Design a protein around this ligand. Structure first.
Ligand SMILES: CC[C@@H](O)Cn1c(=O)n(C)c2ccc(Nc3ccnc(Cl)c3C#N)cc21
Ligand SMILES: CC[C@@H](O)Cn1c(=O)n(C)c2ccc(Nc3ccnc(Cl)c3C#N)cc21
Lengths: 125, 5, 125, 5
């Protein structure tokens, strides 16, 4: 119906609770391996945030894997920063990590993050 | 909170 | 870090994608049965939105169930309206369904929905 | 969109 009311804070409150489930390792169903660093997460949140994970977990064979190994060129810190962004909307972008975060966001197909990284780099050059 | 979206 | 930037639309975009996964029945992991009406959903979204589901899916035995039966007094339409609200932040509250939606939200322990229902009922009496 | 939260 077009007669619905809307709860402004609902989507952010849902994300806060999904992040609390992640911190407590509740119903996490995949481990992402980045250069021997392991990150536990929920497949649905990864798919909702990343074109790469959406492609992986909609594949009829890969949807059933409990471990996914990323390309060895991917920086674990860059991945960690992006995983935290997926679950909080907060991106910890710093001079010392921006190149790695942008390269990781390009690999993960996180369009808005790539765009902001490009703008912050352009401003410094 | 609520609003008319 | 306290130096993070934030993406205003991120949480709502994540919820839009989780709802698209639900519509397409992608990685849904539980069926909620309400008076013989079946609703497929993601346990993590139900837990993030409802005190009742948070209690059910953190229980060491119930966390593994693929089917959950609700109390026979629960109205399927009321449940459907609340499940749609969980995934969209939009509540289809109408004169003809408000009593059922409020009773269902009380059972599901969805505090903000109960509060708004109470206010809309008080305004009509 | 981005903002300072
Ligand atoms: C949260 C912001 C969002 O834009 C993140 N993102 C991005 O940049 N690309 C390129 C994405 C591609 C696919 C998805 N995921 C989905 C896209 C469409 N339909 C579904 Cl069901 C899902 C799920 N899950 C998310 C992406
Ligand atoms: C989205 C808005 C939220 O307020 C909905 N809601 C509500 O009214 N009650 C009473 C709730 C109780 C528990 C939860 N769920 C959690 C609460 C705390 N920690 C965690 Cl990890 C989760 C998860 N999942 C959600 C509830």
């Amino acid at each position: 119906a077009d007669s619905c009311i809307q709860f402004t804070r609902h989507a952010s409150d849902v994300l806060l609770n999904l992040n609390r489930l992640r911190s407590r390792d509740i119903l996490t169903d995949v481990v992402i391996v980045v250069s021997r660093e392991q990150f536990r997460a929920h497949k649905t949140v990864l798919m909702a945030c990343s074109g790469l994970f959406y492609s992986i977990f909609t594949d009829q064979l890969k949807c059933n894997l409990s471990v996914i190994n990323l390309d060895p060129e991917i920086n674990p810190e860059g991945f960690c920063i992006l995983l935290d962004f997926m679950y909080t909307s907060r991106l910890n972008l710093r001079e010392g990590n921006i190149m790695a975060v942008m390269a990781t966001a390009m690999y993960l197909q996180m369009e808005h993050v790539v765009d902001t990284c490009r703008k912050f780099i352009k401003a410094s050059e | 909170a609520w609003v008319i979206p």
